Structure formats: C-alpha cells, structure tokens
C-alpha cells in the first residue's frame, strides 16, 4: 500500500509514534518518505546480503527473519514479510524497538542524512491530526 503524506502521518500518529522517544511525528514521516516513498511493500537488498523491508526499510541482518541472511537475528521476532503489510502495525512496533536500541533514529540512514536537524514539522503541515 502506497500512503500519501498526511494519510501516513495520521496512521503513524494513531500507532503512537508522535514524540516516541522524543521524536516528533514529522521525523517519522520524513524517514518513511526517503526510505520507502511511503510504500509498505518496498524491499532493497544490501551489500552484505541482508534486505531492508517496508515503509521504514527495517533490515534482516538484526530485526526480522527472511531465511536468507545467514548468521542474522530476528529481534522483532517476526517474518520480514510482516513488514510489508498494508497495515503498518508490525513496522511501527518493530521501529519502536529499533529507536529504543541506543542510536535513536540514526539507525535510519535516510533520517540522518535528510531529516535530522531539519524543520521536520513541515512534513505534517496541512494534515488532519
Ligand atoms: Cl510527500
Ligand atoms: Cl536467515
Ligand atoms: Cl496502517
Ligand atoms: Cl535519541
Ligand atoms: Cl513534527
Ligand atoms: Na534475520
């Protein structure tokens, strides 16, 4: 499912990301735009053979099981495929674990490079929230 910006900001807010670990909603919406284009089915394969999955591009090296990242973990204890659903619940629950891991939103490279330090509230202006 490909969300629009405000649709996804609403959903995200509804699953409790606004100010989660101190990260205001716009951080999350920014991250998702640049990670996945707001597409829940996005998948990308990394150089180590792991893969990133879903609207927040969560990686199999550590967070989910895909059966083809040898040596890896499944800390979210989910198939990676659950991160591809039209319902964002499993991606959000897993994103909450990740952001609580030590490095905050720096886990998301696109966040660091494109969202961190910017006026992220732009991303939720004009949304019904
Ligand atoms: Cl947009
Ligand atoms: Cl595996
Ligand atoms: Cl959803
Ligand atoms: Cl932090
Ligand atoms: Cl914000
Ligand atoms: Na894994």
Curated annotation (Swiss-Prot):
Subcellular location: Secreted
GO cellular component terms listed in the entry, alphabetical order: cytoplasm; endoplasmic reticulum; extracellular space
Distribution of this protein across tissues and organs: In the egg white and polymorphonuclear leukocytes.
Pfam families: Lys (PF00062)
Parts forming coiled coils: none
InterPro entries: Glyco_hydro_22, Glyco_hydro_22_CS, Glyco_hydro_22_lys, Lysozyme-like_dom_sf
Record flagged with keyword Oxidoreductase: no
Top-tier EC class: hydrolase
Principal place of residence: secreted
Disulphide bonds in the chain: 6-127, 30-115, 64-80, 76-94
Key words, A-Z: Allergen, Antimicrobial, Bacteriolytic enzyme, Disulfide bond, Glycosidase, Hydrolase, Secreted, Signal
GO biological process, one term: defense response to Gram-negative bacterium
Every C-type lysozyme domain range: 1-129
EC number(s) from the headed UniProt entry: 3.2.1.17
Active-site residues per Swiss-Prot or TrEMBL entry: 35, 52
Domain of life: Eukaryota
Similarity field: Belongs to the glycosyl hydrolase 22 family.
Protein name: Lysozyme C
């Amino acid at each position: 499912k490909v969300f629009g910006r405000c649709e996804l900001a609403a959903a995200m807010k509804r699953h409790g990301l606004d100010n989660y670990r101190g990260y205001s909603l716009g951080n999350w919406v920014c991250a998702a735009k640049f990670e996945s284009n707001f597409n829940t089915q996005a998948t990308n394969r990394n150089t180590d053979g792991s893969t990133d999955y879903g609207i927040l591009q969560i990686n199999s090296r550590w967070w989910c099981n895909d059966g083809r990242t040898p040596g890896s973990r499944n800390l979210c204890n989910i198939p990676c495929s659950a991160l591809l659903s039209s319902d964002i619940t499993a991606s959000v629950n897993c994103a909450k674990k990740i952001v609580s891991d030590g490095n905050g939103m720096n886990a998301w490279v696109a966040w660091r490079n494109r969202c961190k330090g910017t006026d992220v509230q732009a991303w939720i202006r004009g949304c019904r929230l």
